[PDB]
Design a protein around this ligand. Structure first.
Ligand SMILES: CCCCCCCCCCCCO[C@@H]1O[C@H](CO)[C@@H](O[C@H]2O[C@H](CO)[C@@H](O)[C@H](O)[C@H]2O)[C@H](O)[C@H]1O
Lengths: 96, 96, 48, 144, 96, 156, 96, 96, 96, 152
């Protein structure tokens, strides 16, 4: 609310900034004959860490101030869901 | 089993000739068959003959000049004249 | 379409006293004189 | 199309692989993801496994992954095949009058011959040595 | 060829391979069907394959004119191709 | 409508010269029309049956009949490249400048499909090179938009 | 056709001039891809590399392939010819 | 073996500042250098594909990247060079 | 819904047919595309073929072609069924 | 020299030895402008970086995007190699075509030791890239406090 943002803005920024883009090639087929170089172009790749997610840029304010995801959210590795919790003889456990 | 006496023949466009030329060849075949009543009887197409249809051309330039999107044009036409499945509802506990 | 190509199915029967094999052989004869690029095949009861 | 090897792996190969489970008689699984934009995943089964059922079981799992794949991958068509790895034969096609180019002949084969061969019983996989025609729009950034 | 190699370079190596079968194995080789851009990889600018068909066994009398000696001589000649791995080989009774 | 009329519409479309012959002898209505307003002459012109076109005209067919959208047999013949039919129709009084409901002329249609010889015939019979359809387009506009340089030359 | 794609209307300028697809692109029939190029004995060629379905009979399948090819031949454009550069099955028939 | 690849970093902040959407950036980059399967057309009676891609001569050299423009929200044309940076690195052409 | 025969054939029927590969024991395939907006493709198998296996192979090749079909066709669904012509009985229900 | 580019990449100290002693261009450049020094710097081959420099390798050689071996070493956290390069006159404030400096790169990857050396040799802390960013700006964005405090 403070930043005039919603979960829609968060979701949109994550899709844009946690992305894996097919970007094509330099010197790919069909080439100009005589081409010597053939190389993949690598654009955005998936983020890999809480640090990277935290600096996702939601917007910059009129005074050049930046609003980062970590400014509106806690970022951490955690379960896809939190419904199941097991114990082995009273001690924290997992299992199959 | 069809008729013991009957045959089931397929005429085939082997070279991208198109519908009209296939039709002409079919007709040519049917006319020749009809000159052998001594051997062939009731040689006929199993399917349907071409019929009048109403060809409507959308003028892209005029649409663009008027600020009317092709998508609004085409769904207006199809939804109105052809009908359009929108989504589902629940009528007394059954999805329809 | 028939085996993935545009087609038109044609039905008919052998004239009285004539075998279907004979009728089929004629149809093939006639089919051999059609315009370039037009082929044929037998299906259903005739395929067998 | 246009993907590098890591993009293929992390966006397609891993996703399909993670859905590959509860398949009977599976001995092992291997895959290549390459900078041609291509993935191949091979599942090898115990001798005596009914290949029809192996294929059915693989595809039942693949269809759980399908919706998670990039739209551009789904539209290229993913395939599931049960065939030997080696070629049974290569059928070649040439033009003796020299009146069709390599590209012309390849399109002829793709458009008039390949499908019927691919539908023939016993034919597990058909590779075209060439490519079917597409309508190519070759853009010029200066004019754009 | 090494990844990074061009379709044009792969074609040059294929030409050498084809040339060898067409000129040095005239008496043994009936035909060569060479494919640029496909190998057991498969696809790639830096890969290719040649399918070779030999004349009938009857015209290939002697050990020196059988597949093992042909493929061995070929591999040896091809070893002197720069910046490429090229080798001819006979399929086994059972690859598997 | 009449039974002979229907038979004539069918024979004309199918190009059955002899049946047409007999139908003419028996007084089959040359002015018969189906639901879309096509006469035997419309059908013959569309499907390209030259001899039937000539027989129909000899038997009092309306050369300038128009369908429910205002199109004439000359429109059809011109659009589908039937040169000799085009010439016969014109010889027999066809309106070279006839506009359908869209303001489209036989010249527009021939230009659109790139039928050069038909375009020349139409100009020879007085076709109006400056006629505009409902969108303000002429045959020349069509030629350039299609990128047909030969045709564009002719219409200059 | 390329002609039709070329006249796709991208936009009309402020002065009413038209921008067609052909104004910003070359338009041609060309391969879905340009990676695979084959030669037969040094000449332009295409072909089908066929693999046997698991458990299928090699000889039966080869016979069905030839039977299907034979149905296509009579409709080939002039000069087009099937060649047989690589077949594993003749050896089976002959050795047996 | 790993090979040189061209790493391009899209600058989110600059893109936001100029009002250029990440989707337009990625589609322009991908379509031009990688090609894009748009939809189907009918070639001599057979359904086939339509591809958009840069003509070869504009996707051969690293410097070509900055010759591609994206249109910003305010209607201005902005070159790739204004919102991206690039560097050479190594990566795998084939991951097992 | 609302499609004419050619629209059905060229956006549905051809696409499906082009994907009916790698299915065992097929004798032949046939189809009708009609102006009621309907397509039926019938695949007929060798006597002795397991009908359930034939049907699942067909359904599975179709499943993988679904993303190539128009949205409105995906929305209606495409049925794959064992073909039979015999009814045990027909129960009519009327209002009098 | 093509032999040298390869041997350098594989870190074949012994092989670089020969080719060297057989007069292969030490500043041989491949398709992207990388010299044997770029390659040794990237793949972390200290011993080969040393030999190369002892044989007159241009220490400020740059690839087709304006990047130097110091860029590579600093970016991939090769502290030793960074020190050696600088001691041999590597331009500490070298900018690539993007205006990016070795300091920018080290700071981005959070290579603290390396950042200190670069500063030691007079890396300009206020140097801006094409987007006007400093190593400090970067340290802040990445939320790296240990690094930001240093750049101060
Ligand atoms: C004393 C009697 C000896 C022969 C008796 C024959 C009995 C029945 C034989 C039928 C089965 C096949 O028989 C045999 O098959 C092979 C395979 O094509 C042929 O043998 C072969 O001749 C030459 C060299 O030997 C081969 O390169 C060629 O491929 C093949 O034609 C023979 O010409 C044929 O005779």
């Amino acid at each position: 609310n403070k930043f005039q943002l919603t979960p829609v803005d968060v979701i949109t920024a994550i899709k844009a900034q946690n992305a894996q883009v097919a970007a094509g090639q330099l010197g790919g087929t069909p080439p100009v004959k005589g081409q010597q170089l053939n190389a993949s172009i690598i654009a955005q790749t998936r983020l890999t860490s809480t640090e990277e997610f935290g600096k996702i840029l939601l917007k910059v304010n009129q005074d050049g101030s930046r609003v980062l995801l970590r400014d509106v959210a806690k970022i951490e590795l955690g379960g896809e869901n939190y419904d199941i919790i097991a114990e082995f003889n009273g001690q924290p456990a997992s299992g199959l | 089993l069809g008729t013991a006496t009957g045959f089931d023949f397929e005429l085939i466009d082997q070279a991208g000739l198109g519908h009209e030329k296939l039709t002409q060849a079919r007709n040519q075949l049917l006319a020749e068959a009809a000159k052998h009543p001594d051997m062939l009887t009731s040689v006929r197409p199993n399917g349907l003959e071409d019929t009048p249809q109403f060809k409507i051309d959308i003028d892209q330039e005029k649409a663009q000049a008027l600020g009317v999107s092709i998508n609004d044009i085409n769904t207006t036409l199809g939804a109105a004249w052809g009908g359009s499945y929108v989504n589902d509802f629940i009528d007394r506990g059954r999805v329809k | 379409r028939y085996n993935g190509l545009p087609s038109m199915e044609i039905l008919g029967q052998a004239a009285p006293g004539k075998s279907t094999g004979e009728a089929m052989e004629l149809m093939e004869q006639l089919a051999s004189k059609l315009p370039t690029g037009v082929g044929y095949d037998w299906t259903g009861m005739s395929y067998q | 199309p246009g993907a590098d090897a890591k993009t293929v792996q992390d966006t397609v190969t891993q996703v399909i692989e993670q859905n590959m489970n509860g398949i009977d008689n599976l001995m092992y699984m291997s895959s290549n993801s390459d900078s041609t934009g291509t993935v191949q995943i091979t599942l090898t089964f115990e001798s005596g496994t009914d290949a029809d059922i192996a294929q059915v079981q693989v595809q039942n799992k693949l269809q759980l992954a399908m919706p998670l794949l990039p739209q551009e991958v789904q539209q290229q068509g993913v395939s599931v095949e049960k065939s030997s790895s080696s070629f049974l034969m290569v059928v070649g096609v040439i033009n003796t009058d020299g009146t069709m180019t390599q590209e012309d002949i390849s399109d002829y084969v793709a458009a008039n011959m390949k499908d019927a061969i691919s539908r023939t019983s016993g034919v597990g996989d058909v590779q075209l040595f060439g490519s079917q025609y597409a309508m190519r729009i070759w853009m010029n950034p200066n004019e754009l | 060829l090494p990844a990074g190699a061009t379709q044009e370079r792969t074609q040059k190596v294929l030409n050498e391979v084809t040339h060898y079968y067409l000129t040095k194995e005239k008496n043994n080789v009936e035909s060569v069907f060479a494919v640029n851009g496909f190998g057991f990889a498969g696809r790639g600018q830096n890969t290719g394959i040649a399918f070779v068909s030999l004349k009938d066994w009857a015209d290939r009398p002697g050990e020196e004119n059988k597949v093992e000696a042909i493929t061995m001589r070929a591999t040896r000649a091809f070893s002197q191709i720069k910046d490429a791995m090229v080798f001819a080989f006979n399929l086994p009774a059972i690859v598997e | 409508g009449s039974d002979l009329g229907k038979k004539l519409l069918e024979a004309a479309r199918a190009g059955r010269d002899d049946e047409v012959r007999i139908l003419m002898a028996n007084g089959a209505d040359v002015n018969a029309a189906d639901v879309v307003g096509w006469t035997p002459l419309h059908l013959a012109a569309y499907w390209g049956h030259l001899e039937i076109v000539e027989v129909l005209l000899k038997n009092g067919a309306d050369v300038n009949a128009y369908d429910t959208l205002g199109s004439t047999p000359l429109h059809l013949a011109a659009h589908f490249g039937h040169l000799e039919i085009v010439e016969v129709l014109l010889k027999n009084g066809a309106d070279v400048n006839a506009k359908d409901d869209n303001g489209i002329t036989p010249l527009h249609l021939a230009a659109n499909r790139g039928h050069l010889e038909i375009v020349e015939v139409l100009l020879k019979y007085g076709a109006d090179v400056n006629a505009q359809d409902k969108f303000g387009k002429t045959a020349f506009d069509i030629s350039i938009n299609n990128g047909n340089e030969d045709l564009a030359e002719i219409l200059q | 056709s390329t002609e039709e794609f070329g006249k796709i209307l991208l936009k009309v300028n402020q002065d009413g001039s038209r921008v067609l697809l052909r104004d910003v692109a070359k338009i041609e029939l060309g391969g879905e891809n340009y990676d695979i190029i084959a030669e037969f004995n040094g000449q332009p060629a295409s072909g089908l590399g066929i693999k046997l379905a698991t458990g299928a009979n090699a000889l039966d399948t080869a016979a069905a392939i030839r039977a299907e090819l034979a149905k296509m031949e009579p409709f080939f454009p002039s000069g087009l010819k099937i060649v047989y550069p690589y077949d594993t099955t003749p050896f089976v028939k002959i050795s047996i | 073996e790993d090979t040189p690849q061209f790493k391009i970093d899209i600058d989110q902040e600059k893109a936001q500042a100029l009002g250029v959407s990440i989707n337009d950036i990625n589609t322009t980059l991908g379509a031009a250098w990688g090609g894009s399967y748009v939809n189907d057309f009918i070639d001599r009676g057979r359904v086939k594909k339509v591809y958009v891609m840069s003509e070869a001569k504009y996707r051969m050299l690293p410097d070509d990247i900055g010759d591609w423009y994206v249109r910003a929200a305010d209607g201005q044309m902005v070159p790739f060079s204004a919102f991206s940076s690039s560097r050479w690195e190594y990566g795998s052409p084939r991951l097992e």
